[PDB]
Symmetry: D2
Subunit: 359 residues, 4 copies
């Protein structure tokens, strides 16, 4: 008996969430899976406008009593400053729930358009392992000599032995379990003269632990190009918070698009609920036009299943299914405008809704 917390948040969160739930309830009934959903108004800019705070003070004790989070997106600069909204909701989720891994599997699905030249289709496959607790995402620092010629602004990056070690481990593992078993650590150990060399110190230190696994270390600029221009190289790519919510948009949209970009925010020791979300944001530019690609949002529930079940081949089943459901509709051509289709958001929700049965 599972319990799932669903939060559409802002913008297209409301839009793509019901079509994530939809294609999931299909497998639920279809495979005898204990999926008992719920919806929460907070973690939105409506809630913030109304209450002064992004969520109620007791959000956690609330959520702690659930198995997983199915999250939409958060942000509406029109009405709420972006830091306020991310820090006040999602950031507190990942943070106070110790979901230190943020993964973003990157792939070309049979027949997806290519914003890269003539690569064999499917010859692209890897995951991106993003530090999600610390690093360059901070609230530390402040403004000095405010409003004067001499104005200074400080921002601390904080790297610790724990967050780094643990995210570095969880990457000599997702490679310890693959065909290539290769790792590229991202760094900028020429620019940053204190943080990155350290990161490299610990990268290097834990290569000595998995001697069969093969690793290199590429400066985030080149890595970004190599990302677009030679995605066959990469198997595992491990990175700091910033070198996470970076790449995340580039990659899943290196050739394809950010509409088909899944992400997972994980607490491996299960001591807290993990959270599942697409890579994209609230996209105010597109909201209420139901044209938004819900694949990322779907792919997300799939991963929610894949992770969530653990000890069942039962839940495992559902994943592959749903990704094939994705896979068909892709080449079947029932897609959203940011991929070719003339279809709508719910259209593409209903298009997946079919294939799951047909096979």
């Amino acid at each position: 008996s599972f319990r799932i917390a669903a939060i559409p948040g802002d913008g297209i969160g409301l839009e793509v969430l019901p079509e994530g739930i939809r294609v999931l309830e299909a497998a639920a009934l279809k495979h005898g899976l204990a999926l008992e959903f719920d919806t929460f108004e907070w973690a939105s800019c409506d809630y913030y406008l109304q209450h002064g705070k992004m969520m109620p003070d007791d959000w956690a004790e609330q959520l702690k009593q659930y198995d997983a989070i199915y999250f939409g997106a958060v942000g509406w600069p029109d009405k709420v400053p972006d830091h306020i909204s991310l820090w006040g909701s999602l950031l507190k989720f990942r943070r106070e729930f110790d979901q230190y891994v943020n993964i973003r599997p990157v792939r070309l699905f049979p027949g997806v358009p290519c914003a890269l030249a003539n690569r064999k289709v499917g010859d692209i496959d890897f995951v991106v392992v993003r530090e999600n607790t610390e690093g360059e995402y901070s609230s530390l620092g402040g403004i000095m000599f405010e409003n004067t010629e001499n104005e200074i602004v400080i921002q601390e990056s904080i790297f610790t032995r724990r967050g780094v070690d643990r995210i570095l481990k969880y990457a000599f593992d997702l490679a310890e379990k693959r065909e290539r078993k290769h790792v590229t650590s991202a760094t900028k150990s020429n620019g940053m003269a204190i943080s990155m060399p350290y990161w490299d110190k610990r990268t290097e230190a834990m290569a000595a632990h998995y001697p069969h696994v093969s690793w290199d270390k590429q400066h985030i600029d080149i890595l970004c190009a190599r990302f677009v221009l030679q995605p066959e190289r990469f198997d595992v790519v491990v990175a700091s918070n910033l070198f996470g919510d970076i790449l995340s948009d580039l990659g899943p949209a290196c050739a394809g698009t950010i509409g088909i970009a899944p992400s997972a925010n994980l607490n491996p020791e299960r001591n807290f609920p993990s959270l599942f979300e697409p890579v994209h944001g609230s996209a105010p530019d597109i909201f209420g036009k139901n044209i938004a690609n819900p694949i990322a949002m779907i792919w997300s529930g799939a991963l929610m299943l894949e992770f969530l079940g653990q000890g069942d081949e039962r839940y495992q089943r559902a994943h592959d299914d749903m990704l094939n459901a994705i896979e068909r509709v892709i080449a079947d051509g029932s897609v959203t405008p940011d991929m070719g289709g003339t279809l709508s958001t719910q259209q593409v929700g209903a298009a997946i809704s079919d294939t799951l049965a047909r096979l």
Copy 2:
């Protein structure tokens, strides 16, 4: 009567530098231009191995007596830690010479291969304006509780009203002088909760100064994708140190490559020499195989001219020439392996060496 300081530095710096000088001495003689070159051993890892320091203590007083710097690249991790080498040489150049603008013009040259799908050729053109004195490139911070379970690592980002204002100005200017006059400021004002919102505060503040110029502000992740997938959008793109030596590799290699990527490190008030370099690094992987694309290195001297002359239509002339010299050889197909050609570095040096006369 000009004086130019030439420093190949490490790796392919030695390799691409003599072919930068070459195609430049052609125009010099060809247009009556006061180019009196010189070469310096230091800012290399040979020098560092030998002397303990990347350059002599009196490098500056030395260089201050020259008009411009033609720089190769610096770095050799095999023998010198990357931060030590960048900080000890080039970083001190840009820093102690107040070369706060770092620009990287991004373009498709007639017939360049496309790591983006079917775009009109030449339908891509913009410059990237990179803060080069402060920002996320620091030596501030350090390690606490060293070697223990509790190990912490601090890195300060420092933004000031001066460096920010001045780089933001110098961008409502390179657009104040163009067909589109559009600016995209890069930010991550949802992740970074102190630095980026401030940056945006000052971005916004100086949009009120150039009301004809049009601006938006895109989070560095999306901006990176939009970089690859829709480069026609961008005219001017302004960014912090990190959001500089980032993009710089992606962009000039969004479709094309980092071999044809020029950069300029500028001190507009001319109080110090400006420095001219390609975007790429010492590329140990390729050194001594004379296959390295010297275009970036050439394009660099061109820009050295373009900037350096100022009040001459005399020097201006040379630029356009040399870029056409580039332009022909491109479509003429006399290029290096990272572009299609079977040619060598000096081959491609000699290939440019021709066209400059023929027209």
Copy 3:
């Protein structure tokens, strides 16, 4: 025609302020001095309770239109957190008015009790020069991993070439004008490994500017003892913000007491109003018992005069007077409980009120 802003603030500010004004209006009338007082409710915890903020948003434009500030004290932990109240009022005064010098003359007045053993009386005399804009008084930093085993708390000290140079200058000056011309810079350049050595670097650098002036540098611990045990040594003592509102209590109370401790918050270039206050705080423990020593508060107005007049021997006159008015009452024995007397606050206000005429 002068204009004075009077702000009692919290606690005994209300108490000692009317007795500062009192003995001042005496000299005003007595010497033909343009003193046109005013009183402001804000910079108090009553105002903060009422308005949510320590003062109105337009406090500055308001105050900018006045010549000097006669300030009480600020703080009431019972109702307002101490940082909130200091930062929200007085700290903004000293800060946004560029009052970078904070001086605290330390002396034994004929017949004051001695919390030091058998020193010649009057054999003690020096001033303390306190950096008042930057240093260890910051709002920079923050909390990371909040509420967890791993909780970390960051606080930045910021030293700049401006604030340091300028406070160091203004000290090779108050000694350039004295019998001894000696300077002790306070440091802790063994503990603090970045800030203090730098401070010393610049201390040292500006000893080369006033070669007749004699200087040493004593670690703040020893300096504190030497403060109590050998106060004849010190002429000038220059220090960082923290090594300011430190000493300030010790010294003026090394033997005597914090009730007779004047301070001056100065903007030498007069571009802003200077502020005048006693060294002590709101002293909630004593409030509304009118036993509080108003000397510090009086001594303060005296200094307000001494500084304020500048180009008059006219205003200068008043000072010496008022300090003799102090001096008599001291040995005359008309003092408050923290000095021996059975008298009240207004009693001691009226006791000074006399002597000013009698001579």
Copy 4:
């Protein structure tokens, strides 16, 4: 069978150390105590001049094999920068040996001179509990815009939940075991707006754990005065690194002197050796004149015993003895120039050497 590591270090360390050892070997033989001394050249400026580093790389593995450290003092600005020398030796001791408590018992010994007025003699007694791992003693930060008008200098204070909690505990304990059971936490939670309020947050939090123990919290300025002027008040005084090596000189020399000031650097869980030292430093001003008060140095060995024995009443015995040995010689008048005596350092060593037998 104990093993003791003795390190005179610099200056008067060499001077007062043999007279610490002396009066200790007396009790050793006198009480059947396993004291097997040794002497080490390093942690000195001679060693540093010679080797480039304050101690050998393997100092720790060396020392780890000993029970306690009897330390002299470190520092010689004439030849070695003060931070280099403290950080390179003693600071690494306290740090890498997790000696997080630094205690400084403050007392008037029968007939000691009084740099405070007419207090009952012996009516003064308390200990000072100093955080010794973190706080305001850092190597974090650095210099930005070096050598320019805009020069900035950053220093991080780091407070953690561990170091703070643990030093705060170890103080609701040294009071949980006394006549008064009172605690004064030192703070400056009006100046420092991030660190001190936090410190207070955790002070307050752990008052809820020892409800019988009574506590207040005094701003470090006033606390310093109250230190001199009313030392009967204090029982326990708990403080951050800076508010440690501060007070430490003031207090033990509030009336008396820094020559009779003991300190203890403790690792309560005994997982590492604890270190024992006087409060004073190398005192270059006095070195080689054998006039230096070795009481502090003796008092230190006494405490080394007091702590070291633990489960023996055997070693306990020795302490009281040795302090009475101190106590007599004090009133007996066999003291050093900084207390009245005409005696020398070894004279006063031999003076203690007697009394230990006579009773």
